[PDB]
Design a protein around this ligand. Structure first.
Ligand SMILES: *[C@@H]1O[C@H](CO)[C@@H](O[C@@H]2O[C@H](CO)[C@@H](O[C@@H]3O[C@H](CO[C@H]4O[C@H](CO)[C@@H](O)[C@H](O)[C@@H]4O)[C@@H](O)[C@H](O[C@H]4O[C@H](CO)[C@@H](O)[C@H](O)[C@@H]4O)[C@@H]3O)[C@H](O)[C@H]2NC(C)=O)[C@H](O)[C@H]1NC(C)=O
Ligand SMILES: *[C@@H]1O[C@H](CO)[C@@H](O[C@@H]2O[C@H](CO)[C@@H](O[C@@H]3O[C@H](CO[C@H]4O[C@H](CO)[C@@H](O)[C@H](O)[C@@H]4O)[C@@H](O)[C@H](O[C@H]4O[C@H](CO)[C@@H](O)[C@H](O)[C@@H]4O)[C@@H]3O)[C@H](O)[C@H]2NC(C)=O)[C@H](O)[C@H]1NC(C)=O
Ligand SMILES: *[C@@H]1O[C@H](CO)[C@@H](O[C@@H]2O[C@H](CO)[C@@H](O[C@@H]3O[C@H](CO[C@H]4O[C@H](CO)[C@@H](O)[C@H](O)[C@@H]4O)[C@@H](O)[C@H](O[C@H]4O[C@H](CO)[C@@H](O)[C@H](O)[C@@H]4O)[C@@H]3O)[C@H](O)[C@H]2NC(C)=O)[C@H](O)[C@H]1NC(C)=O
Ligand SMILES: *[C@@H]1O[C@H](CO)[C@@H](O[C@@H]2O[C@H](CO)[C@@H](O[C@@H]3O[C@H](CO)[C@@H](O)[C@H](O[C@H]4O[C@H](CO)[C@@H](O)[C@H](O)[C@@H]4O)[C@@H]3O)[C@H](O)[C@H]2NC(C)=O)[C@H](O)[C@H]1NC(C)=O
Ligand SMILES: *[C@@H]1O[C@H](CO)[C@@H](O[C@@H]2O[C@H](CO)[C@@H](O[C@@H]3O[C@H](CO)[C@@H](O)[C@H](O)[C@@H]3O)[C@H](O)[C@H]2NC(C)=O)[C@H](O)[C@H]1NC(C)=O
Ligand SMILES: *[C@@H]1O[C@H](CO)[C@@H](O[C@@H]2O[C@H](CO)[C@@H](O[C@@H]3O[C@H](CO)[C@@H](O)[C@H](O)[C@@H]3O)[C@H](O)[C@H]2NC(C)=O)[C@H](O)[C@H]1NC(C)=O
Ligand SMILES: *[C@@H]1O[C@H](CO)[C@@H](O)[C@H](O)[C@H]1NC(C)=O
Lengths: 305, 313
């Protein structure tokens, strides 16, 4: 039968899951089958349904609860006299690690700006909603008394003003017929957006630094700048109108950008310009260009002797 | 900059073994090499996010273990921390591209040499040859093979050739996890594969068990009653089993009463790829028209067999 899934399932052992065949079928005479492979290339064993945990319900399989055994590839096949279709679903079951409520490999991630609003939502909770709903939030796998600044509405968490204290793993809990559904997200805070172009440190914008090199010598011109949080940092060297790529590719080349420091999204990167076997043409005024969202700044270096 | 969400290539390694993460942009996406691209002034940076939504911190290498060598990153050895998403970015005045590579690091579980989630899989036919190879090994260029995480003396049926394991005749006993080991400068490289043996190709069409091919079984039902007609067959290894009910020329879908429907296929047994499935035909509020001869059709690659059932009373 025709063969091809992007949808992947991650769940903690002891939590209810619903796996759907990605593709009225009973009416058309179509017969539906599932296979568990547990790996790419495996036997794809036919599943004989029990009634306690694994339930064949409509277009889906229900696990109540899930077990470590359940981890694997699930292939849903539809069969007819002349018609067939099948698709494979990946289910990974893991256990919360050592006293924690969640699994390290299995969690969501978010980023927030200091002194700014941020919303945290309980994602992928649709399959347990009826009739048309209670949720509890944990901080570092512990119950907390939440400040009035933080507001809870309908499966979501809102922080009106975000502080450097509000960092870590946020896990929401749902009750599903004597079962718990946990979705955990980790928040990382960064400094707010710059609103200002980066700052040149070496060379400075208005000092006109001087570099001395002898002919047939080696020249190292190293720019340095500070990039506040705002894409990779854009810092590069130019000699007048000519870009680094244009001038004499055999003797002169540009180094890769280095990260001298990083904190809260702010970086202090440095890049260097290297010239070998320096000649009369190489001597002149070199400028380090630094650019971002709000501006383009540059400073100059003089090559002498 | 222009983005390629996630690279198909993913890395799975045991903690304490060497890994090499390759920037996909130089090998697959773009033909131009790192040595010639950098000449054009392109700058390369890496980021470690550990998640699709995380901060993506810029990594300052500065390490004995983590080495920025050309278009790749070297881990010698790898650590449990290293698990995450690695994004390589190329920078220009007006040009940018980035791609993300997934590295997953795990530890051998409870007295075992391997990780259950991280291993290869294979299938073999009984009494036939099958070769097991040490896959995706390179950048570390002799091999030694273990069976069930133990050193073994191998029969002349099993032969060793560089980077491969060959079994002339596969037997039902030689099933399980085969792990090859390589030594790379005081480090060990383990690649483990699991073998599952199945019965050889049928060469014969399936066999009807219930009803039998030439007995013409009879079921008695009263009018306004309930009818359960359950077929049963044996399918040897050869895809889902093709077994279905028919009433004369008409398929089950054709008569399409709200009263008569077909059940889903059930798996009564499984051994070595051989199945003995059963399907049932159900009729509710039986009427005079429903009475007649029903046939259960069973089919596979080499043949089509069928048996008949008579509905009476
Ligand atoms: C028309 O009539 C047919 C009868 O031919 C009905 O089909 C039967 O439906 C019943 C449903 O109750 C089936 O009963 C099931 O038996 C399965 C087989 O047993 C397992 O155990 C042995 C070991 O002894 C294994 O070797 C074997 O491979 C099986 O795995 C069970 O798996 C079923 O589920 C569970 O049952 C008990 C319930 O407490 C659990 O404790 C068990 O752990 C088990 O998981 C179930 O018991 C019966 O097999 C069917 N027969 C056939 C021939 O298909 C149709 O349903 C009916 N049509 C209707 C009503 O529309
Ligand atoms: C939920 O959110 C919390 C924070 O809100 C996260 O906490 C971090 O958890 C990780 C583990 O996943 C911690 O990493 C581990 O802890 C060690 C502590 O680091 C400090 O160590 C000493 C004090 O003991 C300090 O002096 C030092 O400056 C460090 O700040 C790490 O150092 C460990 O790595 C070390 O060990 C390995 C092997 O032993 C070595 O090879 C390494 O080189 C390294 O030395 C270890 O990885 C991390 O520290 C926690 N952060 C904080 C701030 O406490 C949770 O991770 C998060 N939940 C999940 C699932 O991620
Ligand atoms: C190649 O490598 C793979 C993977 O490493 C091996 O697959 C293993 O196969 C063995 C079979 O010999 C499996 O062993 C079995 O473990 C099961 C554990 O389940 C228990 O726990 C769950 C909850 O987590 C319960 O639901 C369940 O009822 C069990 O309690 C059990 O089915 C068996 O363990 C025995 O221990 C329990 C106590 O826990 C006893 O009460 C029972 O009597 C029971 O017999 C069974 O032994 C093992 O789990 C498989 N591993 C994985 C990861 O799937 C291959 O075997 C290996 N190849 C070769 C040739 O060895
Ligand atoms: C051109 O000039 C630039 C700037 O002057 C220069 O950049 C320098 O690069 C080197 C490495 O390529 C840096 O040296 C390292 O700095 C970091 C600390 O941030 C550490 O990794 C190292 O510290 C120790 O390293 C050794 C152990 O690995 C120790 O033995 C050693 O004693 C150190 O303690 C190492 O110092 C250097 O920091 C920068 N320069 C600046 C100012 O940051 C570049 O290399 C020059 N040449 C080119 C581009 O060809
Ligand atoms: C996070 O993971 C840990 C371990 O991975 C989970 O701990 C487990 O907790 C259950 C219930 O408390 C334990 O089962 C019970 O064990 C006691 C032992 O006396 C027994 O009397 C009970 O009848 C029941 O069987 C289980 O042993 C324990 N697992 C361990 C210790 O390895 C924990 O539940 C997970 N979730 C969290 C912390 O939210
Ligand atoms: C980074 O630098 C600039 C900014 O966009 C780009 O410059 C030019 O890009 C073109 C197409 O990518 C390059 O094509 C070449 O054209 C020459 C023409 O003589 C031809 O001989 C080559 O075979 C090739 O087709 C061109 O070299 C390049 N010019 C430069 C770098 O000076 C560049 O493409 C950007 N991106 C990179 C380098 O990946
Ligand atoms: C399992 O990993 C440990 C390191 O945590 C190592 O010492 C041990 O040798 C490994 N097992 C085998 C069979 O090599």
């Amino acid at each position: 039968c025709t063969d091809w899934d992007i949808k992947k399932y991650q769940v903690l052992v002891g939590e209810p899951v619903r796996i759907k065949c990605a593709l009225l079928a009973q009416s058309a005479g179509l017969s539906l089958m599932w296979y568990k492979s547990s790996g790419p290339g495996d036997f794809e064993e036919p599943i004989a349904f029990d009634g306690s945990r694994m339930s064949k319900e409509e277009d889906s399989i229900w696990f109540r609860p899930t077990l470590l055994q359940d981890s694997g590839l699930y292939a849903c096949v539809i069969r007819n006299s002349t018609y067939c279709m099948k698709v494979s679903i990946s289910l990974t079951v893991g256990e919360n690690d050592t006293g924690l409520c969640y699994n390290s490999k299995m969690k969501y991630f978010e980023k927030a700006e200091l002194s700014k609003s941020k919303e945290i939502s309980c994602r992928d909770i649709e399959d347990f909603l009826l009739p048309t709903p209670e949720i509890l939030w944990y901080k570092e796998c512990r119950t907390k008394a939440w400040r009035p600044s933080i507001v809870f509405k309908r499966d979501t968490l809102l922080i009106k003003e975000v502080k450097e204290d509000d960092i870590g793993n946020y896990t929401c809990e749902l009750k599903y017929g004597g079962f718990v559904v946990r979705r955990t997200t980790e928040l990382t805070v960064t400094a707010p957006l710059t609103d200002k172009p980066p700052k040149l440190l070496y060379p400075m914008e208005s000092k006109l630094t001087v570099q001395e090199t002898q002919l047939g010598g080696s020249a190292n011109l190293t720019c340095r700048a500070f990039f506040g949080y705002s894409v990779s940092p854009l810092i590069y060297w130019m000699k007048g109108e000519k870009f680094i790529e244009d001038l004499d590719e055999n003797r002169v080349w540009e180094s890769d950008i280095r990260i001298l420091k990083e904190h809260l999204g702010e970086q202090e990167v440095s890049i260097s310009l290297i010239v070998d076997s320096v000649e009369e043409g190489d001597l002149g005024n070199y400028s380090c260009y630094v650019e971002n969202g709000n501006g383009r700044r540059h400073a100059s270096v003089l090559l002498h002797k």
